PDB file of all heavy atoms in Angstrom:
ATOM      1  N   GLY A 158      -4.865  15.372 -27.669  1.00 46.67           N
ATOM      2  CA  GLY A 158      -3.915  14.223 -27.385  1.00 46.67           C
ATOM      3  C   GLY A 158      -2.774  14.465 -26.514  1.00 46.67           C
ATOM      4  O   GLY A 158      -1.908  13.641 -26.412  1.00 46.67           O
ATOM      5  N   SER A 159      -2.804  15.638 -25.897  1.00 45.47           N
ATOM      6  CA  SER A 159      -1.672  15.926 -24.960  1.00 45.47           C
ATOM      7  C   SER A 159      -1.979  15.673 -23.661  1.00 45.47           C
ATOM      8  O   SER A 159      -3.129  15.835 -23.103  1.00 45.47           O
ATOM      9  CB  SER A 159      -1.411  17.472 -25.255  1.00 45.47           C
ATOM     10  OG  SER A 159      -2.502  18.283 -24.902  1.00 45.47           O
ATOM     11  N   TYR A 160      -0.919  15.310 -22.879  1.00 45.73           N
ATOM     12  CA  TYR A 160      -1.114  15.089 -21.441  1.00 45.73           C
ATOM     13  C   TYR A 160      -1.133  16.376 -20.612  1.00 45.73           C
ATOM     14  O   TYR A 160      -0.736  17.505 -21.099  1.00 45.73           O
ATOM     15  CB  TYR A 160       0.125  14.323 -20.819  1.00 45.73           C
ATOM     16  CG  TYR A 160       0.229  12.926 -21.444  1.00 45.73           C
ATOM     17  CD1 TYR A 160       1.571  12.383 -21.453  1.00 45.73           C
ATOM     18  CD2 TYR A 160      -0.819  12.172 -21.820  1.00 45.73           C
ATOM     19  CE1 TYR A 160       1.646  11.097 -21.830  1.00 45.73           C
ATOM     20  CE2 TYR A 160      -0.580  10.841 -22.279  1.00 45.73           C
ATOM     21  CZ  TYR A 160       0.694  10.152 -22.343  1.00 45.73           C
ATOM     22  OH  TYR A 160       0.905   9.095 -22.739  1.00 45.73           O
ATOM     23  N   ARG A 161      -1.618  16.373 -19.269  1.00 44.74           N
ATOM     24  CA  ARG A 161      -1.385  17.389 -18.484  1.00 44.74           C
ATOM     25  C   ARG A 161      -1.570  16.851 -16.909  1.00 44.74           C
ATOM     26  O   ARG A 161      -2.529  16.157 -16.699  1.00 44.74           O
ATOM     27  CB  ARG A 161      -2.253  18.610 -18.618  1.00 44.74           C
ATOM     28  CG  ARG A 161      -3.877  18.399 -18.377  1.00 44.74           C
ATOM     29  CD  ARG A 161      -4.445  19.702 -18.245  1.00 44.74           C
ATOM     30  NE  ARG A 161      -5.856  19.556 -18.188  1.00 44.74           N
ATOM     31  CZ  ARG A 161      -6.739  19.553 -17.160  1.00 44.74           C
ATOM     32  NH1 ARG A 161      -6.119  19.376 -16.032  1.00 44.74           N
ATOM     33  NH2 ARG A 161      -7.957  19.370 -17.216  1.00 44.74           N
ATOM     34  N   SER A 162      -0.646  17.187 -16.075  1.00 47.80           N
ATOM     35  CA  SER A 162      -0.645  16.675 -14.780  1.00 47.80           C
ATOM     36  C   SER A 162      -1.659  17.409 -13.926  1.00 47.80           C
ATOM     37  O   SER A 162      -1.595  18.665 -13.855  1.00 47.80           O
ATOM     38  CB  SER A 162       0.799  16.875 -14.136  1.00 47.80           C
ATOM     39  OG  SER A 162       0.871  16.405 -12.813  1.00 47.80           O
ATOM     40  N   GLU A 163      -2.523  16.596 -13.288  1.00 48.61           N
ATOM     41  CA  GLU A 163      -3.533  17.174 -12.373  1.00 48.61           C
ATOM     42  C   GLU A 163      -3.528  16.618 -11.126  1.00 48.61           C
ATOM     43  O   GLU A 163      -3.583  15.341 -10.952  1.00 48.61           O
ATOM     44  CB  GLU A 163      -4.886  17.121 -13.048  1.00 48.61           C
ATOM     45  CG  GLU A 163      -6.085  17.459 -12.253  1.00 48.61           C
ATOM     46  CD  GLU A 163      -7.434  17.590 -12.986  1.00 48.61           C
ATOM     47  OE1 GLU A 163      -7.381  17.839 -14.196  1.00 48.61           O
ATOM     48  OE2 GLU A 163      -8.386  17.284 -12.315  1.00 48.61           O
ATOM     49  N   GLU A 164      -3.390  17.468 -10.054  1.00 48.56           N
ATOM     50  CA  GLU A 164      -3.426  16.906  -8.625  1.00 48.56           C
ATOM     51  C   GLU A 164      -4.937  16.437  -8.305  1.00 48.56           C
ATOM     52  O   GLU A 164      -5.843  16.984  -8.823  1.00 48.56           O
ATOM     53  CB  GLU A 164      -2.979  17.937  -7.679  1.00 48.56           C
ATOM     54  CG  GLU A 164      -1.519  18.424  -7.843  1.00 48.56           C
ATOM     55  CD  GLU A 164      -1.173  19.580  -6.826  1.00 48.56           C
ATOM     56  OE1 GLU A 164      -1.237  19.225  -5.647  1.00 48.56           O
ATOM     57  OE2 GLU A 164      -0.835  20.630  -7.260  1.00 48.56           O
ATOM     58  N   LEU A 165      -4.900  15.435  -7.443  1.00 47.97           N
ATOM     59  CA  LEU A 165      -6.180  15.121  -6.981  1.00 47.97           C
ATOM     60  C   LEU A 165      -6.134  14.378  -5.555  1.00 47.97           C
ATOM     61  O   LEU A 165      -5.079  13.835  -5.166  1.00 47.97           O
ATOM     62  CB  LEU A 165      -6.938  14.121  -7.917  1.00 47.97           C
ATOM     63  CG  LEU A 165      -6.443  12.748  -8.125  1.00 47.97           C
ATOM     64  CD1 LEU A 165      -7.263  11.942  -9.174  1.00 47.97           C
ATOM     65  CD2 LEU A 165      -4.972  12.419  -8.408  1.00 47.97           C
ATOM     66  N   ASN A 166      -7.265  14.287  -4.897  1.00 48.76           N
ATOM     67  CA  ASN A 166      -7.328  13.769  -3.509  1.00 48.76           C
ATOM     68  C   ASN A 166      -7.850  12.310  -3.447  1.00 48.76           C
ATOM     69  O   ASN A 166      -7.474  11.517  -2.633  1.00 48.76           O
ATOM     70  CB  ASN A 166      -7.972  14.695  -2.636  1.00 48.76           C
ATOM     71  CG  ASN A 166      -7.479  16.068  -2.497  1.00 48.76           C
ATOM     72  OD1 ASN A 166      -6.663  16.438  -3.348  1.00 48.76           O
ATOM     73  ND2 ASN A 166      -8.082  16.898  -1.603  1.00 48.76           N
ATOM     74  N   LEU A 167      -8.809  12.094  -4.289  1.00 52.09           N
ATOM     75  CA  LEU A 167      -9.641  10.740  -4.116  1.00 52.09           C
ATOM     76  C   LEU A 167     -10.015  10.223  -5.509  1.00 52.09           C
ATOM     77  O   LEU A 167     -10.449  10.892  -6.436  1.00 52.09           O
ATOM     78  CB  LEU A 167     -10.954  11.196  -3.301  1.00 52.09           C
ATOM     79  CG  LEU A 167     -11.931   9.963  -3.104  1.00 52.09           C
ATOM     80  CD1 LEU A 167     -11.112   8.840  -2.263  1.00 52.09           C
ATOM     81  CD2 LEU A 167     -13.064  10.497  -2.267  1.00 52.09           C
ATOM     82  N   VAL A 168      -9.823   8.837  -5.542  1.00 51.63           N
ATOM     83  CA  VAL A 168     -10.311   8.127  -6.790  1.00 51.63           C
ATOM     84  C   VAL A 168     -11.125   7.040  -6.344  1.00 51.63           C
ATOM     85  O   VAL A 168     -10.748   6.143  -5.588  1.00 51.63           O
ATOM     86  CB  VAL A 168      -9.080   7.694  -7.464  1.00 51.63           C
ATOM     87  CG1 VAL A 168      -9.598   6.713  -8.722  1.00 51.63           C
ATOM     88  CG2 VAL A 168      -8.135   8.800  -8.071  1.00 51.63           C
ATOM     89  N   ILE A 169     -12.283   6.957  -6.851  1.00 48.43           N
ATOM     90  CA  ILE A 169     -13.266   5.859  -6.728  1.00 48.43           C
ATOM     91  C   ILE A 169     -13.105   4.807  -7.926  1.00 48.43           C
ATOM     92  O   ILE A 169     -13.500   5.187  -9.002  1.00 48.43           O
ATOM     93  CB  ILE A 169     -14.680   6.164  -6.629  1.00 48.43           C
ATOM     94  CG1 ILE A 169     -14.816   7.232  -5.347  1.00 48.43           C
ATOM     95  CG2 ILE A 169     -15.556   4.997  -6.206  1.00 48.43           C
ATOM     96  CD1 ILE A 169     -14.276   6.836  -4.144  1.00 48.43           C
ATOM     97  N   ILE A 170     -12.597   3.629  -7.734  1.00 44.83           N
ATOM     98  CA  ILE A 170     -12.414   2.645  -8.737  1.00 44.83           C
ATOM     99  C   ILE A 170     -13.086   1.343  -8.511  1.00 44.83           C
ATOM    100  O   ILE A 170     -13.334   0.980  -7.352  1.00 44.83           O
ATOM    101  CB  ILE A 170     -10.935   2.462  -8.997  1.00 44.83           C
ATOM    102  CG1 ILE A 170     -10.675   1.948 -10.454  1.00 44.83           C
ATOM    103  CG2 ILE A 170     -10.326   1.700  -7.902  1.00 44.83           C
ATOM    104  CD1 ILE A 170      -9.320   1.804 -10.854  1.00 44.83           C
ATOM    105  N   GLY A 171     -13.212   0.533  -9.536  1.00 46.27           N
ATOM    106  CA  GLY A 171     -13.914  -0.770  -9.244  1.00 46.27           C
ATOM    107  C   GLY A 171     -13.056  -1.781  -8.619  1.00 46.27           C
ATOM    108  O   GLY A 171     -11.771  -1.477  -8.492  1.00 46.27           O
ATOM    109  N   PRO A 172     -13.631  -2.836  -8.081  1.00 47.00           N
ATOM    110  CA  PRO A 172     -12.817  -3.863  -7.173  1.00 47.00           C
ATOM    111  C   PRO A 172     -11.973  -4.556  -8.125  1.00 47.00           C
ATOM    112  O   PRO A 172     -12.199  -4.709  -9.392  1.00 47.00           O
ATOM    113  CB  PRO A 172     -13.967  -4.681  -6.594  1.00 47.00           C
ATOM    114  CG  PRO A 172     -15.056  -4.611  -7.686  1.00 47.00           C
ATOM    115  CD  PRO A 172     -14.984  -3.165  -8.097  1.00 47.00           C
ATOM    116  N   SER A 173     -10.966  -5.296  -7.617  1.00 50.21           N
ATOM    117  CA  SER A 173      -9.939  -6.161  -8.176  1.00 50.21           C
ATOM    118  C   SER A 173     -10.632  -7.603  -8.521  1.00 50.21           C
ATOM    119  O   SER A 173     -11.695  -7.585  -8.852  1.00 50.21           O
ATOM    120  CB  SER A 173      -8.709  -6.255  -7.563  1.00 50.21           C
ATOM    121  OG  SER A 173      -7.704  -7.024  -8.246  1.00 50.21           O
ATOM    122  N   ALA A 174      -9.834  -8.591  -8.182  1.00 52.71           N
ATOM    123  CA  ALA A 174     -10.214  -9.873  -8.319  1.00 52.71           C
ATOM    124  C   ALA A 174     -11.345 -10.181  -7.322  1.00 52.71           C
ATOM    125  O   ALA A 174     -12.523 -10.679  -7.745  1.00 52.71           O
ATOM    126  CB  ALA A 174      -9.047 -10.940  -8.203  1.00 52.71           C
ATOM    127  N   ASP A 175     -11.102  -9.963  -6.068  1.00 49.45           N
ATOM    128  CA  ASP A 175     -12.165 -10.175  -4.970  1.00 49.45           C
ATOM    129  C   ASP A 175     -13.088  -8.959  -5.023  1.00 49.45           C
ATOM    130  O   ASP A 175     -12.570  -7.923  -4.574  1.00 49.45           O
ATOM    131  CB  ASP A 175     -11.394 -10.440  -3.737  1.00 49.45           C
ATOM    132  CG  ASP A 175     -12.489 -10.930  -2.563  1.00 49.45           C
ATOM    133  OD1 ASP A 175     -13.600 -11.237  -3.059  1.00 49.45           O
ATOM    134  OD2 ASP A 175     -12.167 -10.897  -1.462  1.00 49.45           O
ATOM    135  N   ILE A 176     -14.236  -9.150  -5.621  1.00 48.10           N
ATOM    136  CA  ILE A 176     -15.231  -8.053  -5.704  1.00 48.10           C
ATOM    137  C   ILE A 176     -15.667  -7.375  -4.445  1.00 48.10           C
ATOM    138  O   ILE A 176     -15.669  -6.165  -4.293  1.00 48.10           O
ATOM    139  CB  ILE A 176     -16.428  -8.523  -6.496  1.00 48.10           C
ATOM    140  CG1 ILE A 176     -16.054  -9.067  -7.850  1.00 48.10           C
ATOM    141  CG2 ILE A 176     -17.515  -7.378  -6.598  1.00 48.10           C
ATOM    142  CD1 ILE A 176     -17.289  -9.404  -8.702  1.00 48.10           C
ATOM    143  N   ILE A 177     -16.018  -8.233  -3.328  1.00 46.17           N
ATOM    144  CA  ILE A 177     -16.514  -7.651  -2.079  1.00 46.17           C
ATOM    145  C   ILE A 177     -15.443  -6.940  -1.310  1.00 46.17           C
ATOM    146  O   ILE A 177     -15.730  -6.279  -0.225  1.00 46.17           O
ATOM    147  CB  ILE A 177     -17.388  -8.683  -1.459  1.00 46.17           C
ATOM    148  CG1 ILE A 177     -18.274  -8.104  -0.492  1.00 46.17           C
ATOM    149  CG2 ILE A 177     -16.440  -9.725  -0.775  1.00 46.17           C
ATOM    150  CD1 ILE A 177     -19.313  -7.031  -1.041  1.00 46.17           C
ATOM    151  N   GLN A 178     -14.150  -7.285  -1.543  1.00 47.57           N
ATOM    152  CA  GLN A 178     -13.115  -6.914  -0.691  1.00 47.57           C
ATOM    153  C   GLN A 178     -12.840  -5.393  -0.954  1.00 47.57           C
ATOM    154  O   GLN A 178     -11.828  -5.052  -1.612  1.00 47.57           O
ATOM    155  CB  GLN A 178     -11.882  -7.730  -0.822  1.00 47.57           C
ATOM    156  CG  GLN A 178     -10.957  -7.577   0.348  1.00 47.57           C
ATOM    157  CD  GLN A 178     -11.538  -8.148   1.597  1.00 47.57           C
ATOM    158  OE1 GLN A 178     -12.411  -9.076   1.544  1.00 47.57           O
ATOM    159  NE2 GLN A 178     -11.170  -7.653   2.718  1.00 47.57           N
ATOM    160  N   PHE A 179     -13.654  -4.586  -0.389  1.00 47.80           N
ATOM    161  CA  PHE A 179     -13.396  -3.087  -0.563  1.00 47.80           C
ATOM    162  C   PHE A 179     -12.163  -2.569   0.342  1.00 47.80           C
ATOM    163  O   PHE A 179     -12.190  -3.068   1.550  1.00 47.80           O
ATOM    164  CB  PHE A 179     -14.729  -2.356  -0.193  1.00 47.80           C
ATOM    165  CG  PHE A 179     -15.938  -2.785  -0.936  1.00 47.80           C
ATOM    166  CD1 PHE A 179     -17.131  -2.777  -0.299  1.00 47.80           C
ATOM    167  CD2 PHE A 179     -15.826  -3.179  -2.323  1.00 47.80           C
ATOM    168  CE1 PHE A 179     -18.264  -3.199  -1.119  1.00 47.80           C
ATOM    169  CE2 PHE A 179     -16.831  -3.668  -2.951  1.00 47.80           C
ATOM    170  CZ  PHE A 179     -18.190  -3.625  -2.368  1.00 47.80           C
ATOM    171  N   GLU A 180     -11.479  -1.721  -0.103  1.00 50.73           N
ATOM    172  CA  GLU A 180     -10.406  -1.122   0.725  1.00 50.73           C
ATOM    173  C   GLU A 180     -10.025   0.156   0.172  1.00 50.73           C
ATOM    174  O   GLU A 180     -10.271   0.681  -0.936  1.00 50.73           O
ATOM    175  CB  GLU A 180      -9.225  -2.067   0.790  1.00 50.73           C
ATOM    176  CG  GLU A 180      -8.482  -2.227  -0.630  1.00 50.73           C
ATOM    177  CD  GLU A 180      -7.151  -2.915  -0.464  1.00 50.73           C
ATOM    178  OE1 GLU A 180      -6.652  -2.856   0.580  1.00 50.73           O
ATOM    179  OE2 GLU A 180      -6.746  -3.500  -1.554  1.00 50.73           O
ATOM    180  N   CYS A 181      -9.377   1.077   1.158  1.00 51.62           N
ATOM    181  CA  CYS A 181      -8.830   2.348   0.761  1.00 51.62           C
ATOM    182  C   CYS A 181      -7.326   2.333   0.777  1.00 51.62           C
ATOM    183  O   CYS A 181      -6.734   2.204   1.817  1.00 51.62           O
ATOM    184  CB  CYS A 181      -9.357   3.329   1.668  1.00 51.62           C
ATOM    185  SG  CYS A 181      -8.739   5.125   1.405  1.00 51.62           S
ATOM    186  N   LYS A 182      -6.726   2.434  -0.426  1.00 49.94           N
ATOM    187  CA  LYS A 182      -5.184   2.271  -0.491  1.00 49.94           C
ATOM    188  C   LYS A 182      -4.585   3.373  -1.231  1.00 49.94           C
ATOM    189  O   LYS A 182      -5.334   4.143  -2.141  1.00 49.94           O
ATOM    190  CB  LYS A 182      -4.747   0.823  -1.040  1.00 49.94           C
ATOM    191  CG  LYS A 182      -5.082   0.658  -2.346  1.00 49.94           C
ATOM    192  CD  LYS A 182      -4.982  -0.827  -2.709  1.00 49.94           C
ATOM    193  CE  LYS A 182      -4.808  -1.037  -4.140  1.00 49.94           C
ATOM    194  NZ  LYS A 182      -3.472  -0.619  -4.732  1.00 49.94           N
ATOM    195  N   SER A 183      -3.293   3.582  -1.298  1.00 53.07           N
ATOM    196  CA  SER A 183      -2.676   4.690  -2.018  1.00 53.07           C
ATOM    197  C   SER A 183      -1.285   4.385  -2.223  1.00 53.07           C
ATOM    198  O   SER A 183      -0.575   3.406  -1.834  1.00 53.07           O
ATOM    199  CB  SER A 183      -2.639   6.093  -1.173  1.00 53.07           C
ATOM    200  OG  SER A 183      -2.021   5.848   0.044  1.00 53.07           O
ATOM    201  N   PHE A 184      -0.599   5.071  -3.168  1.00 52.82           N
ATOM    202  CA  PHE A 184       0.968   4.904  -3.470  1.00 52.82           C
ATOM    203  C   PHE A 184       1.687   5.438  -2.534  1.00 52.82           C
ATOM    204  O   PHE A 184       1.615   6.552  -1.964  1.00 52.82           O
ATOM    205  CB  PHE A 184       1.168   5.480  -4.799  1.00 52.82           C
ATOM    206  CG  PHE A 184       0.444   4.892  -5.992  1.00 52.82           C
ATOM    207  CD1 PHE A 184      -0.657   5.573  -6.676  1.00 52.82           C
ATOM    208  CD2 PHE A 184       0.768   3.663  -6.399  1.00 52.82           C
ATOM    209  CE1 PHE A 184      -1.293   4.995  -7.675  1.00 52.82           C
ATOM    210  CE2 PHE A 184       0.114   3.052  -7.431  1.00 52.82           C
ATOM    211  CZ  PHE A 184      -0.943   3.759  -8.135  1.00 52.82           C
ATOM    212  N   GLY A 185       2.760   4.716  -2.046  1.00 52.86           N
ATOM    213  CA  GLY A 185       3.668   5.099  -0.941  1.00 52.86           C
ATOM    214  C   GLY A 185       4.900   5.726  -1.408  1.00 52.86           C
ATOM    215  O   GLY A 185       5.226   5.780  -2.620  1.00 52.86           O
ATOM    216  N   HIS A 186       5.767   6.325  -0.429  1.00 52.37           N
ATOM    217  CA  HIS A 186       7.058   6.783  -0.761  1.00 52.37           C
ATOM    218  C   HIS A 186       8.094   5.870  -0.250  1.00 52.37           C
ATOM    219  O   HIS A 186       7.863   5.161   0.699  1.00 52.37           O
ATOM    220  CB  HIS A 186       7.147   8.169   0.010  1.00 52.37           C
ATOM    221  CG  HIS A 186       8.149   9.060  -0.527  1.00 52.37           C
ATOM    222  ND1 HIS A 186       9.410   9.080  -0.006  1.00 52.37           N
ATOM    223  CD2 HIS A 186       8.147   9.971  -1.511  1.00 52.37           C
ATOM    224  CE1 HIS A 186      10.167   9.985  -0.724  1.00 52.37           C
ATOM    225  NE2 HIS A 186       9.392  10.568  -1.585  1.00 52.37           N
ATOM    226  N   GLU A 187       9.253   5.825  -1.083  1.00 52.49           N
ATOM    227  CA  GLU A 187      10.333   5.082  -0.750  1.00 52.49           C
ATOM    228  C   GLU A 187      10.939   5.341   0.613  1.00 52.49           C
ATOM    229  O   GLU A 187      11.747   4.525   1.236  1.00 52.49           O
ATOM    230  CB  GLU A 187      11.353   4.984  -1.802  1.00 52.49           C
ATOM    231  CG  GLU A 187      11.617   6.367  -2.508  1.00 52.49           C
ATOM    232  CD  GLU A 187      10.708   6.587  -3.714  1.00 52.49           C
ATOM    233  OE1 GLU A 187      10.622   5.651  -4.571  1.00 52.49           O
ATOM    234  OE2 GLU A 187       9.984   7.595  -3.698  1.00 52.49           O
ATOM    235  N   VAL A 188      10.786   6.503   1.146  1.00 51.64           N
ATOM    236  CA  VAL A 188      11.334   7.074   2.353  1.00 51.64           C
ATOM    237  C   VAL A 188      10.232   7.487   3.314  1.00 51.64           C
ATOM    238  O   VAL A 188      10.331   7.069   4.482  1.00 51.64           O
ATOM    239  CB  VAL A 188      12.262   8.365   2.101  1.00 51.64           C
ATOM    240  CG1 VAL A 188      12.867   8.724   3.427  1.00 51.64           C
ATOM    241  CG2 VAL A 188      13.387   7.867   1.163  1.00 51.64           C
ATOM    242  N   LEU A 189       9.399   8.310   2.894  1.00 52.01           N
ATOM    243  CA  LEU A 189       8.265   8.859   3.722  1.00 52.01           C
ATOM    244  C   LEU A 189       7.073   8.070   3.896  1.00 52.01           C
ATOM    245  O   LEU A 189       6.777   7.136   3.059  1.00 52.01           O
ATOM    246  CB  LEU A 189       7.811  10.274   3.251  1.00 52.01           C
ATOM    247  CG  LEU A 189       8.967  11.280   3.037  1.00 52.01           C
ATOM    248  CD1 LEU A 189       8.409  12.546   2.319  1.00 52.01           C
ATOM    249  CD2 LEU A 189       9.637  11.611   4.338  1.00 52.01           C
ATOM    250  N   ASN A 190       6.392   8.110   5.124  1.00 52.66           N
ATOM    251  CA  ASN A 190       5.225   7.583   5.289  1.00 52.66           C
ATOM    252  C   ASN A 190       4.016   8.534   5.156  1.00 52.66           C
ATOM    253  O   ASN A 190       3.738   9.064   6.224  1.00 52.66           O
ATOM    254  CB  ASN A 190       5.107   6.753   6.525  1.00 52.66           C
ATOM    255  CG  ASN A 190       6.118   5.701   6.603  1.00 52.66           C
ATOM    256  OD1 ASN A 190       7.290   5.847   7.227  1.00 52.66           O
ATOM    257  ND2 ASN A 190       5.862   4.473   6.027  1.00 52.66           N
ATOM    258  N   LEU A 191       3.545   8.814   4.085  1.00 53.73           N
ATOM    259  CA  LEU A 191       2.602   9.862   3.657  1.00 53.73           C
ATOM    260  C   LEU A 191       1.248   9.766   4.542  1.00 53.73           C
ATOM    261  O   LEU A 191       0.586  10.763   4.735  1.00 53.73           O
ATOM    262  CB  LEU A 191       2.227   9.983   2.297  1.00 53.73           C
ATOM    263  CG  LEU A 191       3.510  10.190   1.327  1.00 53.73           C
ATOM    264  CD1 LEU A 191       3.131  10.241  -0.095  1.00 53.73           C
ATOM    265  CD2 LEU A 191       4.264  11.399   1.835  1.00 53.73           C
ATOM    266  N   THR A 192       0.969   8.585   4.839  1.00 53.19           N
ATOM    267  CA  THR A 192      -0.478   8.324   5.600  1.00 53.19           C
ATOM    268  C   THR A 192      -0.274   8.342   7.059  1.00 53.19           C
ATOM    269  O   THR A 192      -1.252   8.431   7.758  1.00 53.19           O
ATOM    270  CB  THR A 192      -0.949   6.912   5.235  1.00 53.19           C
ATOM    271  OG1 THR A 192      -0.133   5.873   5.575  1.00 53.19           O
ATOM    272  CG2 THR A 192      -1.309   6.869   3.656  1.00 53.19           C
ATOM    273  N   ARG A 193       0.968   8.493   7.574  1.00 52.31           N
ATOM    274  CA  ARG A 193       1.340   8.563   9.002  1.00 52.31           C
ATOM    275  C   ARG A 193       2.219   9.729   9.347  1.00 52.31           C
ATOM    276  O   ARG A 193       2.681   9.799  10.497  1.00 52.31           O
ATOM    277  CB  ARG A 193       1.725   7.275   9.421  1.00 52.31           C
ATOM    278  CG  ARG A 193       0.854   6.114   9.290  1.00 52.31           C
ATOM    279  CD  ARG A 193       1.331   4.753  10.052  1.00 52.31           C
ATOM    280  NE  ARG A 193       2.597   4.436   9.443  1.00 52.31           N
ATOM    281  CZ  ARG A 193       2.731   3.459   8.592  1.00 52.31           C
ATOM    282  NH1 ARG A 193       1.646   2.807   8.142  1.00 52.31           N
ATOM    283  NH2 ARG A 193       3.978   3.168   8.028  1.00 52.31           N
ATOM    284  N   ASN A 194       2.495  10.688   8.548  1.00 53.84           N
ATOM    285  CA  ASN A 194       3.424  11.780   8.837  1.00 53.84           C
ATOM    286  C   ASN A 194       2.727  13.127   8.688  1.00 53.84           C
ATOM    287  O   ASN A 194       3.352  14.105   8.824  1.00 53.84           O
ATOM    288  CB  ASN A 194       4.638  11.742   7.969  1.00 53.84           C
ATOM    289  CG  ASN A 194       4.383  12.206   6.628  1.00 53.84           C
ATOM    290  OD1 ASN A 194       3.300  12.037   6.030  1.00 53.84           O
ATOM    291  ND2 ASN A 194       5.462  12.593   5.933  1.00 53.84           N
ATOM    292  N   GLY A 195       1.282  12.985   8.438  1.00 54.95           N
ATOM    293  CA  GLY A 195       0.695  14.278   8.308  1.00 54.95           C
ATOM    294  C   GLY A 195       0.553  14.828   6.870  1.00 54.95           C
ATOM    295  O   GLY A 195      -0.270  15.754   6.676  1.00 54.95           O
ATOM    296  N   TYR A 196       1.332  14.401   5.921  1.00 53.19           N
ATOM    297  CA  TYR A 196       1.403  14.822   4.587  1.00 53.19           C
ATOM    298  C   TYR A 196       0.133  14.518   3.918  1.00 53.19           C
ATOM    299  O   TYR A 196      -0.643  15.371   3.423  1.00 53.19           O
ATOM    300  CB  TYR A 196       2.508  14.338   3.860  1.00 53.19           C
ATOM    301  CG  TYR A 196       3.819  15.005   4.267  1.00 53.19           C
ATOM    302  CD1 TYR A 196       4.073  15.786   5.398  1.00 53.19           C
ATOM    303  CD2 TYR A 196       5.021  14.749   3.399  1.00 53.19           C
ATOM    304  CE1 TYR A 196       5.245  16.408   5.649  1.00 53.19           C
ATOM    305  CE2 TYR A 196       6.239  15.351   3.704  1.00 53.19           C
ATOM    306  CZ  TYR A 196       6.374  16.106   4.856  1.00 53.19           C
ATOM    307  OH  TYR A 196       7.565  16.694   5.230  1.00 53.19           O
TER     308      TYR A 196
END
């Protein structure tokens, strides 16, 4: 019943309200742009 932090690169999850609307998104940084700065 204990947590443990695990790093990961990719998560495949089911669609939201609109089923066919597939997209690739991620959590952003309040300062940095992780998807456009090479990180």
Side-chain angles (χ1 to χ4, degrees):
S159 59
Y160 294 155
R161 70 161 169 90
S162 182
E163 175 169 330
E164 298 183 60
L165 79 180
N166 302 7
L167 180 59
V168 175
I169 308 300
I170 200 177
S173 180
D175 189 13
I176 299 182
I177 200 56
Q178 203 62 29
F179 306 146
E180 65 168 338
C181 178
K182 69 195 201 70
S183 59
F184 296 107
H186 197 271
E187 37 271 309
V188 179
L189 303 174
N190 301 98
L191 304 178
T192 59
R193 294 189 300 264
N194 74 335
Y196 285 13

